[PDB]
Write a protein that binds this ligand. Sequence first.
Ligand code: M22
Lengths: 558, 404
Amino acid sequence: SPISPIETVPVKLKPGMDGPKVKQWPLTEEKIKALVEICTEMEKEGKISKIGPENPYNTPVFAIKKKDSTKWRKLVDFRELNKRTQDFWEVQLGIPHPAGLKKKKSVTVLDVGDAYFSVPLDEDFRKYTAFTIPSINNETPGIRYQYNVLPQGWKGSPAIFQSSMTKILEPFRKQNPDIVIYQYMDDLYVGSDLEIGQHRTKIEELRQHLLRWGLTTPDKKHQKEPPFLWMGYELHPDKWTVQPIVLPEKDSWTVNDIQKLVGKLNWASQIYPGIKVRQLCKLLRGTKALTEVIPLTEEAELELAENREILKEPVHGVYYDPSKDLIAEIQKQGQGQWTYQIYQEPFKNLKTGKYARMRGAHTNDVKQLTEAVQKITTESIVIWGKTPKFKLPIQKETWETWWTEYWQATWIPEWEFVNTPPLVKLWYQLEKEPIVGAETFYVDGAANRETKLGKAGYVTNRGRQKVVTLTDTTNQKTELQAIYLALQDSGLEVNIVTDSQYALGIIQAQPDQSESELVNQIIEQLIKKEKVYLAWVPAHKGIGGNEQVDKLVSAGIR
Amino acid sequence: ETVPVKLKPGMDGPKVKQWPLTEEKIKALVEICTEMEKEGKISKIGPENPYNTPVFAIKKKDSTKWRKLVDFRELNKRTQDFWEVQLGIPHPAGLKKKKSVTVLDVGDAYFSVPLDEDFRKYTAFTIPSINNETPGIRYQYNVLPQGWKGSPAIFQSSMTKILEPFRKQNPDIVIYQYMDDLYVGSDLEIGQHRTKIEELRQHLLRWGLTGYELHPDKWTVQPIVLPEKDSWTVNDIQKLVGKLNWASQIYPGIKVRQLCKLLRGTKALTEVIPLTEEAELELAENREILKEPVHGVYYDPSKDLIAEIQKQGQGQWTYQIYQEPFKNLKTGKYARHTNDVKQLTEAVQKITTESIVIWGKTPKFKLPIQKETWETWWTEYWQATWIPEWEFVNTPPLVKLWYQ
Ligand SMILES: N#Cc1cc(Cl)cc(Oc2cc(OCc3n[nH]c4ccccc34)ccc2Cl)c1
């Protein structure tokens, strides 16, 4: 195979470090033989060169057989050389998403054959790649060799090959602006809008140009045909989709079966709208062993089923027309679960997906909706280089109200409300002013760091008063408990003064769901009310009713 | 003949990730680097260069032309010994006192000066492709890069020469150089000021180099403001003693006892209460107290500056600059087709530029936003040639009001 005439990438070892010098284990006669056969051939083809014992470096060599077959493969353990080799630039920092591919008249995939071996290695670095084929036991000094090409398993090969292929293509890319070439690993994906003629021809001017540079590629008849089964996808000429998803019918599900399941599902989620995975996921929580069978929860039984239906029948995605806009639609599936679809032309999706994440311990749909919009915005820039227009299940009035009053800067790009229940709303609002003729509850809560014992209570201006003991709490827990009491013993309207910025902050944010059951009951109470006012005062400041509940709940506690 | 740059020992080049860019900004950037390459300012690079600094495309202030903005925040940190304790540019306390200060871009002065061959790698950056069609276009500088704090450190000598005549002839004009910009202060009539600036631009013009009016001296207070009123409520007192309480610790000698005893027993919030005059003595002493500086708070050059920003509402934002929590060096308010991000961006730059003028150093921002939101959007409104450091926080429910 040709060995590219191209320039060399100067490679250097890591500062203050020297090349490797690892001792060779002695191998059996059958192995020393194989390596001698393999090595001479490599040397013949210019891939490796024979050297002396003046080269102090060394990597261990090994030879494996053939699972089923009877051929020998030589394995070079470049661990120590890799640990001494300089760091390179990150090859590709992402991979093309089908939905970002533009429709092209004709596309031919071109895999370079023997990629690494078709490209040279910095003359002055070749020395560190020295290895030895041990002699029959101890006698006779080994047969030393070194690389002239990019070795397999070495830190810099993927990086240097890519660079070379980039440099080797630049020329062609100038005299062919209308031609698209996708560089992925050691593949080339070519697409143009010319008729088959100038195409099957241009591809040839390509393969050839590739060859003057030591790079061989498959010729027609050997070139693959659509649908391309690339990276878990199916690349048809007019659509795309994930490769066939097979949901394993089972009797008992082990941790490892659910895990694989969740993954097939998530992958499927890129084009099959409505894929849910929270119930299946909850099982994995704390998980026993890999082989430990887990009984399918009934919600999980119900999720898996809904999923099976979605998967029944095939769904496909379309490609990207750069002239049309991008429309992103979001929907609330429930339990902090969102699902979105991206299309240019109404209902012909380029791609789908889902958002779950619990950002914070207490959140609401408004906060979640805008977190998903941002996650989608980023996604779009990545794939299409531009952000979509949104259609959200949130009333423009709700959005305004919330954004306006929230302490934090929030900003949704261009959007439009779409009536697709469930609709996003706020389950309650805290009054800005104190409710006249409404019982003022002065709440409070304490907890002993030593005994972990707590006390939560309140004193109203209406004469009422209460105190409750808690067994394994914290101040935070007692202070929230205190507000819960006030909300319980108070009726449709109240004013509540606390000295808990913590509780304040939590509630002032209009949370509609929390990891805390307490916070959940409070929410439930806040939604019941007709009007609630909640204020804060400093603690241990002789503030009226305040100093009163303190003594009440401080008794015994502290 | 280049000056040599050495990274701060036991630490190496920046390997910062590159944010996804929009097609529009990517093309704008390709055109730019294509020209820079020609002019020989930058050079394409090989995989054997593991470094990276993010690069963005901005539009500037009222400009139709795209401009390149390299985020050398990391490279800056890793070179702090060079540009700070070795080749530093002294900051003049005179600046903040001038009636008028004008800001000029000077970043073009650097492309005429070459960068130490051995430092070049550290200036690597990438122009990303879309949907990862291809490998990004890797580049590295051959000349002093704009945005890098080592640039004005090096150019210092040449700048000193370029300005000698002008300075000699206007001993009452202060010219400070912070990164890509030139700060020129004077107490002249606006017209004589504007005139000297144009005169200063000409000198600049004879060496290649090719304003925006600030008025520092008119940069005043923003004391914690206590309400004046007729007929008080339990609530208002509560709010008052809470705001006054928090005003303490930072403010020396704030009294609340009087106001407190009026709140005795457990009364309704709506209930109205007559203010005992001594209480007014407190409001008086506090109000008077609040209307002054702090006392005991001084700027320490060896300390980072910090800036907190609070979204108040209706296009208003408050902010404080300090080094030690509650020891405010300065506080103020920025007031606004503007959205939350646009507005917040505008505050960040406003505050920063003042910091550059007052202390000749930028604060580290604590932004009341989502790291993700801010990150995707901030560039649509950035106009500065620099970027301050920033972390994200969740504003404290009270602090926002105590500062309104
Ligand atoms: N393997 C692989 C493989 C993997 C990748 Cl990432 C890309 C690729 O080539 C393309 C696909 C395109 O998108 C869809 C398309 N347009 N025309 C087609 C004809 C047949 C099949 C798909 C298409 C458009 C252009 C090209 Cl360069 C092939």
